[PDB]
Design a binder for these strands. Structure first.
Ligand SMILES: [Mg+2]
Ligand SMILES: [Mg+2]
Ligand SMILES: [Mg+2]
Ligand SMILES: [Mg+2]
Ligand SMILES: [Mg+2]
Ligand SMILES: [Mg+2]
Ligand SMILES: [Mg+2]
Ligand SMILES: [Mg+2]
Ligand SMILES: [Mg+2]
Ligand SMILES: [Mg+2]
Ligand SMILES: [Mg+2]
Ligand SMILES: [Mg+2]
Ligand SMILES: [Mg+2]
Ligand SMILES: [Mg+2]
Ligand SMILES: [Mg+2]
Ligand SMILES: [Mg+2]
Ligand SMILES: [Mg+2]
Ligand SMILES: [Mg+2]
Ligand SMILES: [Mg+2]
Ligand SMILES: [Mg+2]
Ligand SMILES: [Mg+2]
Ligand SMILES: [Mg+2]
Ligand SMILES: [Mg+2]
Ligand SMILES: [Mg+2]
Ligand SMILES: [Mg+2]
Ligand SMILES: [Mg+2]
Ligand SMILES: [Mg+2]
Ligand SMILES: [Mg+2]
Ligand SMILES: [Mg+2]
Ligand SMILES: [Mg+2]
Lengths: 46, 15, 127, 41, 97, 176, 88, 201, 122
RNA sequence: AACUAAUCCUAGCCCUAGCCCUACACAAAUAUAAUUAUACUAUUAUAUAAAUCAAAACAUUUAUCCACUAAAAGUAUUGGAGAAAGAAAUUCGUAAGGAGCUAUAGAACUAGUACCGCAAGGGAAAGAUGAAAGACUAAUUAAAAGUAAGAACAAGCAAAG
RNA sequence: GAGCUACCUAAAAACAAUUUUAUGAAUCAACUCGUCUAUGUGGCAAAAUAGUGAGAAGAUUUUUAGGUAGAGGUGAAAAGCCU
RNA sequence: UCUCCAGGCAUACGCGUAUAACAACUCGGAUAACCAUUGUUAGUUAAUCAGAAUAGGCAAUAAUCACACUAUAAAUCACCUAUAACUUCUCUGUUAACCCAACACCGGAAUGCCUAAAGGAAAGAUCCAAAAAGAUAAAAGGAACUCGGCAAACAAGAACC
């Protein structure tokens, strides 16, 4: 069919997957935050 | 094919 | 009061008194058409409709029969010279219906109340 | 950019000054004039 | 090409300032001073290349030896990669064998 | 009443309004707490009126008469806040000696930084509170590498600033 | 007073097939929030009797209005015989 | 901001917003830093023009932009411009003063009209005063109207203004009671309940 | 495609997602989804009587301001408690145990307005 | 006889030297779907670095990656004894500057921003008057390609004699 | 990285009329799918449009949240899918 | 006012001021008028709509108009026993032509009710060329076309491998 519309926005899905609490759950996720703080990013997560 | 673009900056010129 | 700590209340606690208040409010002319009794206020976002009733009745000695409030979303669409969105501050609008048949309308502030024949030759010269 | 050629203007002029009487882009473009001039010489 | 439409400012050098006037003094401190100090000891520069010269690969390794333990993580990482690139160049490439 | 929000009816429609000087911090100190409590509400009503008037000017797209009045009132209210807080702060030091009014402690987050933690009011002790035992005030070894990098990043930034100031002195001495 | 879109219903308390279609009297109970003492504290003393008037006008018109539709009268065809109902 | 040029218009006016837009990146001005103690030029002081169009003409300082080390003298170093120009009318020609750097002017001996250099020195009372390098003398600070334009002595008490005596009145009584405890006693509020224990953490 | 830079507020998200704008709570939610307001949790503004008040928002320019001296604990002690102790010391009627006689509070517990931790707002 | 344009100098940067640190930012909020004033379900890094690459393949192996300068010494040793690797004993030592960059350069940086990706993440571009703009924003230039001023006139690598 | 897609768990929703009967049966919409031809081809479209076709009470379609992750996952096996 | 077309009003998920008036006429709409664009000012008002105390004891008997009728795939807190508390209105959502597709994209998008009472406009002015695309009509013949009855048809029937 016609591709390009994979993104089907849902705030509950978004926040669970890439949210603050989700990132802090695992050390591998906390190290994602730690690098982002090093670079200077405006937003560390969703 | 590839894809990249540039912004139309507001460019206020009133000096 | 805003940006201050409210003591935690447990059964049998004293009444909470705020002697000096951080909430400052402004009365605005209605955008739409409102009933004569209804009065509009812009108030700090941390103020409750209950506080406004107490706020007006005690500080201003105004009888209030009902209060209704809403939270207004400020625009975040305008971009500056660096293409950074500017956010218009969100504010709280309060609708206050006066009591005892009292009537109020916003006052109207600010009652405010050559020589064609000789073209282009300097007229200073007498010659 | 410690060292850059500040006199490349005159190097192009040497080739171009021998191409003014030509017709077309060869009289004004160095990539095209230079080839035209060598045959002329 | 394009060239400046105005002359740049004149550059004036004072050749009798204190640094230029006394340049070179004490270069013979050793032979004329009973060899108390070698002239190499008068050089002001990086600790790892005062009185020493070598090619970049040698220079890279020498910088590591003196201040390898006092370097920043990113700088040390780049130095290690710079050494490994030079090693394969000087020891595996080049016209002559 | 509601009329207090608007200014004196006569003053409406005048380009400029005369205003006295604002209250200084030293003068407020001489006043007793009774006056400070009373004075605050007097200023509060003044602030509301000017906020009411200034906002109305935007609707009419006309310049506010005597805009300087609001700054004087706001500065006066801040001075009253300063005096009262200073009086209370001194009393706390005498009776207790604690520097700050609210309890807090120096603690480390999971991101390897020292953060001043402000305490909150709770109805149960900390060891029985299951929301407190989700917050973490310690760091695992994996934050060790990132801790050093912040030291170096700040060290780089500090070094550049010192060098930059040195150049600016050179330009000044060359100029003069 | 807000707006929603749900089913419009003209119901007299019973379907059209019911033999009993007219009305005699209605009994309404004012909710606790609207009782006399609560209104006084809220400072809306005048509304002590206004609450009664609002319910009487609203409910009786709905009941009588629904009755007319059962007899077949609607907006264009005005009611020939007035419809009367009571409420307490 | 790093890119902000101070001009002649008072900051925050329409002129200063027009000259310095947020995107301005004009070449910085290099100004010889001058210590607060070092500066000796103040509004109202008569000074003499060392060099320029009006060199040797004494004038009165009327403005000091210390950010640019500028001193502006009334009616001197003055060029011409049109004020109030409109589409209908040309306007009124006026002569506008231009800023002068400090080193281009000198202060004047109070008694005698000469450009006497001065040095900062204390007095018996301890107040800092400017003293002439030669013919040592005390040049008083020149009284000048305030920028806001309000005149204290002629100011007349009006509504919303406290009387001078009332402001001077002192009624604070030092006591180990907070404002939260003084008001209740004065206002007669009585409360006998006490807050329950709270576990701060 | 979600905007990461805008603040997360209750206007956004589904119906279920809600949060406050910072308004202080004034009641309790009991079982069966019933709200029960508590009068004590509702702040009460203590407003003084302004009759006969001689202070207005603005001050006269003529009035001269004084020297700023931030109040310090030592200064307050000298004014209030020192004179009592000094006179008592001459009379000899002073002891360490009765510092409360001059106004000392051993513990803030039992005070309506606790100095630390503060139990009263501005 | 000019349009498009071009000219420009300081914003900052780079490498050293010296130097551990004691820049941990009112008040309020945030680990809940972060930045939502109070109880519910409580909270905790990792077993040996691999491979590319070299040995003209590849399979043991392959400097750095992974403890003071100089000398002993590329020596003794180690190694499909091949490519290659490589000591020690023992001697010696008191240790603010620029033949750097100047807006396609120097950092990616005016900014980790805009923009792009669900996310990890990737990642820009540009500015230029004067002492004074409370002097109607200067200048400066047959100057790039591109046009115009001024379409063309049998025949041809467009020129040369 | 499973908001696309393969699969699964949980909580749910849609199915008119007609004939059979008592159903992975029939005619045929909504709805799901994508046999054929034509146009399009930097297109409306990085897979569409116009017709024509298949299923349409079921191994049915759809909605919401969650789970399975690359030495792997899923697979009515096309080495098909996993932005 | 006339001519003609036939998915429309709400809800959820989503989006985040694109809503509305005024003023501008640089930019955006692939052109104009007008604004969806720029700037300023406004806006969405709920006890009913929507969202967010403790310890025990014990449940054989679907749904389908649930009666009849059968079947098989076997199918949605309450009520008690005791303890504790005895009179409350705060907070948040509410606008729009809107979302996923770089786009004012002939595409994708769930539920409720209804099918015009709601919602809309295929043609900027011209002109009648070839070629190309689509629709309709056909003297006689009736697959003689073609790899093949592909496409089309006033046909849409029958049998076979
Ligand atoms: Mg995509
Ligand atoms: Mg989907
Ligand atoms: Mg090999
Ligand atoms: Mg091979
Ligand atoms: Mg650069
Ligand atoms: Mg760059
Ligand atoms: Mg040209
Ligand atoms: Mg010829
Ligand atoms: Mg899912
Ligand atoms: Mg499958
Ligand atoms: Mg059916
Ligand atoms: Mg399919
Ligand atoms: Mg079929
Ligand atoms: Mg079939
Ligand atoms: Mg079927
Ligand atoms: Mg197969
Ligand atoms: Mg992919
Ligand atoms: Mg609009
Ligand atoms: Mg208009
Ligand atoms: Mg378009
Ligand atoms: Mg607009
Ligand atoms: Mg509401
Ligand atoms: Mg409800
Ligand atoms: Mg709506
Ligand atoms: Mg049309
Ligand atoms: Mg046409
Ligand atoms: Mg036909
Ligand atoms: Mg025919
Ligand atoms: Mg055939
Ligand atoms: Mg066919």
């Amino acid at each position: 069919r016609a591709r390009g519309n994979e993104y089907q926005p849902s705030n509950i899905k978004r926040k669970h997957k890439h949210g603050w609490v989700r990132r802090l759950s695992t050390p591998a996720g906390v190290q994602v935050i730690l690098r982002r703080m090093l670079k200077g990013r405006k937003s560390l997560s969703h | 094919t590839k894809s990249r673009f540039r912004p139309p900056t507001p460019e206020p010129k009133y000096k | 009061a805003r940006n201050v700590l409210y003591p935690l209340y447990q059964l049998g606690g004293p009444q909470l008194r705020v002697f000096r208040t951080n909430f400052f409010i402004q009365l605005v002319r209605p955008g739409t058409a409102q009933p004569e009794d209804t009065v509009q206020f812009r108030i700090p976002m941390e103020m409750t409709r209950v506080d406004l009733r107490n706020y007006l009745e005690q500080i201003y000695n105004v009888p209030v029969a009902a209060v209704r409030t809403r939270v207004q979303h400020g625009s975040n669409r305008r971009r500056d010279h660096k293409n950074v969105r500017i956010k218009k501050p969100d504010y709280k609008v309060a609708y206050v219906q006066l009591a005892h048949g009292q009537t109020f309308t916003f006052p109207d502030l600010f009652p405010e109340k050559s020589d064609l024949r000789c073209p282009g030759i300097p007229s200073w010269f007498g010659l | 950019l410690r060292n850059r050629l500040t006199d490349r203007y005159w190097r192009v002029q040497e080739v171009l000054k021998h191409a003014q009487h030509f017709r077309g882009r060869k009289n004004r473009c160095y990539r095209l004039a230079v080839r035209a001039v060598t045959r002329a010489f | 090409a394009f060239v400046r439409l105005t002359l740049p400012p004149p550059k004036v050098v004072d050749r009798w300032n204190e640094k230029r006037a006394l340049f070179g003094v004490y270069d013979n401190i050793g032979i004329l001073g009973n060899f108390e100090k070698h002239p190499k000891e008068l050089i002001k520069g990086p600790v790892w290349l005062r009185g020493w010269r070598g090619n970049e690969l040698q220079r890279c390794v020498r910088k590591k030896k003196f201040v390898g333990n006092r370097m920043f993580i990113e700088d040390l990482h780049n130095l290690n990669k710079r050494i490994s690139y030079l090693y394969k160049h000087f020891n595996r490439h080049g016209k002559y064998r | 009443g509601l009329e207090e929000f608007f200014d004196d009816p006569k003053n409406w429609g005048e380009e400029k309004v005369k205003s006295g000087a604002s209250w200084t911090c030293q003068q407020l100190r001489n006043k007793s707490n009774e006056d400070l409590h009373k004075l605050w509400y007097v200023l509060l009503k003044e602030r509301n009126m000017l906020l009411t008037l200034e906002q109305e000017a935007k609707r009419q797209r006309l310049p506010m008469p005597s805009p300087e009045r609001l700054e004087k009132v706001v500065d006066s209210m801040d001075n009253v806040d300063k005096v009262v807080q200073e009086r209370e702060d001194a009393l706390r030091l005498l009776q207790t000696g604690q520097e700050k009014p609210r309890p807090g402690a120096w603690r480390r987050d999971i991101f390897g930084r020292i953060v001043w933690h402000k305490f909150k009011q709770w109805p149960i002790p900390w060891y029985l509170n299951k929301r407190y035992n989700r917050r973490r005030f310690f760091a695992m070894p994996y934050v060790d590498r990132f801790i050093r990098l912040r030291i170096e990043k700040h060290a780089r930034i500090e070094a550049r600033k010192r060098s930059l100031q040195k150049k600016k002195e050179k330009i000044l001495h060359a100029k003069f | 007073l807000f707006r929603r879109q749900y089913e419009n219903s003209i119901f007299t308390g019973s379907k059209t097939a019911d033999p009993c279609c007219y009305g005699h009297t209605q009994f309404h109970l004012i909710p606790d929030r609207l009782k006399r003492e609560r209104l006084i504290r809220q400072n809306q003393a005048e509304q002590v009797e206004a609450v009664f008037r609002a319910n009487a006008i609203a409910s009786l018109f709905a009941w009588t209005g629904a009755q007319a539709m059962y007899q077949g009268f609607w907006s264009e065809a005005d009611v020939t015989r007035p419809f009367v109902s009571q409420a307490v | 901001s790093p890119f902000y040029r101070y001009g002649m218009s008072r900051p925050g006016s329409i002129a200063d917003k027009r000259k310095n837009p947020p995107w301005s990146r004009r070449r910085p001005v290099v100004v010889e830093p001058i210590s607060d103690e070092d500066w000796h030029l103040f509004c109202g002081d008569m000074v003499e023009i060392l060099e320029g169009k009006d060199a040797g003409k004494q004038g009165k300082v009327v403005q000091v932009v210390r950010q640019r080390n500028w001193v502006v003298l009334e009616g001197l170093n003055t060029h011409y411009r049109y004020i109030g120009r409109t589409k209908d009318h040309r306007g009124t020609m006026i002569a506008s003063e231009a800023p002068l750097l400090h080193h281009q002017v000198k202060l004047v001996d109070p008694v005698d009209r000469k450009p006497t250099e001065i040095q900062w020195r204390f007095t018996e009372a301890g107040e800092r005063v400017r003293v002439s390098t030669r013919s040592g003398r005390i040049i008083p600070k020149p009284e000048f109207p305030r920028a806001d334009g309000i005149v204290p002595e002629t100011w007349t008490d009006g509504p919303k203004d406290t009387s001078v005596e009332d402001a001077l009145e002192r009624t604070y009584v030092p006591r180990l009671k907070t404002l939260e405890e003084d008001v209740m006693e004065a206002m007669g509020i009585q409360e006998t309940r006490r807050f329950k224990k709270v576990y701060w953490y | 495609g979600a905007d990461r830079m805008s603040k997360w507020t209750s206007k956004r998200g589904p119906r279920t997602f809600t949060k406050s704008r910072g308004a202080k709570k004034t009641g309790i939610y009991t079982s069966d989804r019933k709200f029960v307001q508590i009068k004590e949790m509702v702040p009460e503004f203590v407003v003084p009587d302004l009759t006969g008040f001689k202070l207005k928002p603005y001050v006269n320019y003529r009035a001269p301001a004084g020297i700023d001296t931030p109040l310090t604990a030592k200064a307050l002690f000298q004014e209030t408690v020192a004179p009592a102790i000094e006179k008592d010391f001459k009379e000899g009627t002073f002891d360490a145990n009765n510092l409360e006689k001059y106004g000392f509070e051993p513990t803030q517990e039992g005070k309506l307005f606790q100095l630390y931790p503060k139990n009263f707002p501005r």
